[PDB]
Design a protein around this ligand. Structure first.
Ligand SMILES: Cc1cc2nc3c(=O)[nH]c(=O)nc-3n(C[C@H](O)[C@H](O)[C@H](O)COP(=O)(O)OP(=O)(O)OC[C@H]3O[C@@H](n4cnc5c(N)ncnc54)[C@H](O)[C@@H]3O)c2cc1C
Length: 376
C-alpha cells in the first residue's frame, strides 16, 4: 500500500524500482526525459562485484540474462608505464551505458512516467508527500526517493547545506574505435583488456582502458551498433589548463592533449589522433566533504544525488546500484512487517554514508595522485 515515488529513471532509480516490485511494493518513477532519447550516451560502464550483486538480486531473471548476454569481461593486472614506454609495475563486467539502460528499462514501461520534471515537494499534514512537476502536475506518495543525479533538486531541497568543492584536478576523456586498422597500428597492451597508466615526469597522468559503446550515437537505442573502444583519460591540475577548457572544440581538446604529450611515446599520440571527434569530454572534478548524519524522514536519496558531485570516471554506477539494493532491502523490511519506515530509512542512510564516505575519499586521493604521483 505504501507508494514509493522515485525521481529519476537512471541507473539507481530503475534498479530500485525493480527491487521494490520484487518485494511487492508499489512504485512509480518520474523521469524528466522522453521515453526515446535523441542522442545515445557514448560511453561504457564497468560493473564491479557490488553492481553485479545489485543487478542479480533486483532484476527479473529475463533482464539479468540479457545483462549477462550483453556484457563482456574486462581485466585485471593494471600496468604502469612511464611516458617513454618503459614498464614500471604490473575481473569486471563491461557494458555500454545504452545497453545497460535498455536492460534496466525493460519491464518498467508502465512504472516510468516520462516527461515529468521534479521541481519541489511538500509534506502533507495527514502524512504523505506531494510532488510538483515542471508542467504543473502533481502526485502524492508515501516515500520520496531522489535518484535524480549529481545536481539533484531533491537533495538541494532536502539537504541544502551539502556543498561541493573543486578538487583542483580536471580531465579530458576521449574514445577511439578499435577498428581493424587501428588494431594493426597499436601495440597489443592497448587492446588486450588490461588497463594502463602512463606516469610522466610532468604533474599529470594518462589512463587507458576500454569501453563497449555505440559506433553512432544518433540512432535509436534498440539499433545501437556496439563495438570496442579504447578510452583515454588525460588528468592534470585545473590551473594547468585554460580557464575555459570546458568550452573548447573537440579539435582544440585533441590538440591540447597532444601538446601536453610532446616527447611521450608515439603510440599514445596515435591513440589520441585517432579518437572520435564527436565524443571528447572535458571535466572539472568536484567532490564533497564528509557526509554527517541527518535526521531521517520519508524523503531520502540515492546514487549521484548523494554520492558524486561530478558525473565522472569512477564507480558511480556501481554505488548507485549498491544503494538501490540496500534501500530495497530496508523498505522490504517495512513492507514485510519487521521495521518502522523511518527507522528502516535511517538504517539505509547510515550504511550508505559509511561506504559513500570511504569511496569519496578513495576518489579524491586517486585524483590527487594523478598530479602528485605519491603512489609510484
Ligand atoms: C563517461 C562516463 C563513464 C563512466 N563510467 C563508469 C564506470 O565504468 N563505472 C561506474 O560505476 N560508473 C561510471 N560512471 C558513472 C555513472 O554513469 C553514474 O555515476 C551513474 O549514472 C549514477 O547513477 P544515478 O542513477 O545516480 O544517476 P543517473 O544515472 O544520472 O540518473 C539520473 C536520472 O534522473 C533524471 N533527472 C534529473 N533531474 C530530474 C528531475 N528534476 N526530474 C525528473 N528526473 C530527473 C535524469 O534524466 C536521469 O535519468 C561513468 C560516468 C561517465 C560520465
Amino acid at each position: 500500500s505504501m507508494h514509493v515515488g522515485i525521481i529519476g529513471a537512471g541507473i539507481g532509480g530503475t534498479c530500485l524500482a525493480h527491487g521494490l516490485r520484487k518485494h511487492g511494493i508499489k512504485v512509480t518513477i518520474y523521469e524528466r526525459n522522453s521515453a526515446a532519447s535523441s542522442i545515445l550516451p557514448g560511453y561504457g560502464i564497468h560493473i564491479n562485484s557490488f553492481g553485479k550483486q545489485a543487478l542479480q538480486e533486483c532484476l527479473p531473471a529475463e533482464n539479468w540474462l540479457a545483462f549477462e548476454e550483453a556484457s563482456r569481461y574486462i581485466g585485471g593486472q593494471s600496468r604502469f608505464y612511464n611516458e617513454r614506454m618503459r614498464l614500471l609495475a604490473v575481473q569486471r563486467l563491461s557494458i555500454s551505458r545504452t545497453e545497460l539502460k535498455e536492460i534496466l528499462n525493460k519491464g518498467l514501461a508502465n512504472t516510468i512516467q516520462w516527461n515529468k520534471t521534479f521541481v519541489r515537494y511538500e509534506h502533507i499534514e495527514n502524512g504523505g508527500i506531494k510532488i510538483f512537476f515542471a508542467d504543473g502536475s502533481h502526485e502524492n506518495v508515501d516515500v520520496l526517493v531522489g535518484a535524480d543525479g549529481s545536481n539533484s533538486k531533491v537533495r538541494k531541497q532536502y539537504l541544502p547545506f551539502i556543498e561541493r568543492f573543486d578538487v583542483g584536478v580536471s580531465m579530458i576523456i576521449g574514445r577511439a574505435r578499435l577498428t581493424p586498422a587501428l588494431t594493426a597500428l597499436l601495440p597489443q597492451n592497448f587492446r588486450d583488456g588490461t588497463p594502463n597508466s602512463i606516469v610522466p615526469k610532468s604533474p599529470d597522468w594518462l589512463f587507458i582502458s576500454m569501453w563497449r559503446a555505440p559506433v553512432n550515437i544518433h540512432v535509436e537505442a534498440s539499433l545501437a551498433e556496439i563495438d570496442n573502444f579504447i578510452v583515454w583519460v588525460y588528468v592534470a591540475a585545473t590551473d594547468s589548463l585554460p580557464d575555459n577548457i570546458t568550452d573548447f572544440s573537440a579539435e582544440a581538446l585533441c590538440d591540447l592533449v597532444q601538446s601536453r604529450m610532446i616527447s611521450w611515446d608515439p603510440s599514445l599520440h596515435t591513440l589520441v589522433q585517432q579518437s572520435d571527434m564527436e565524443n571528447i569530454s572535458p571535466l572539472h572534478l568536484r567532490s564533497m566533504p564528509h557526509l554527517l548524519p541527518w535526521k531521517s524522514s520519508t524523503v531520502t536519496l540515492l546514487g549521484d544525488a548523494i554520492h558524486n558531485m561530478t558525473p565522472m570516471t569512477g564507480s558511480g554506477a556501481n554505488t548507485a546500484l549498491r544503494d538501490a539494493l540496500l534501500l530495497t532491502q530496508k523498505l522490504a523490511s517495512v513492507a514485510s512487517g519487521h521495521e518502522e519506515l523511518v527507522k528502516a530509512i535511517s538504517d539505509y542512510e547510515q550504511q550508505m554514508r559509511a561506504y559513500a564516505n570511504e569511496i569519496v575519499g578513495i576518489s579524491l586521493r586517486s585524483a590527487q595522485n594523478a598530479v602528485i604521483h605519491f603512489s609510484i
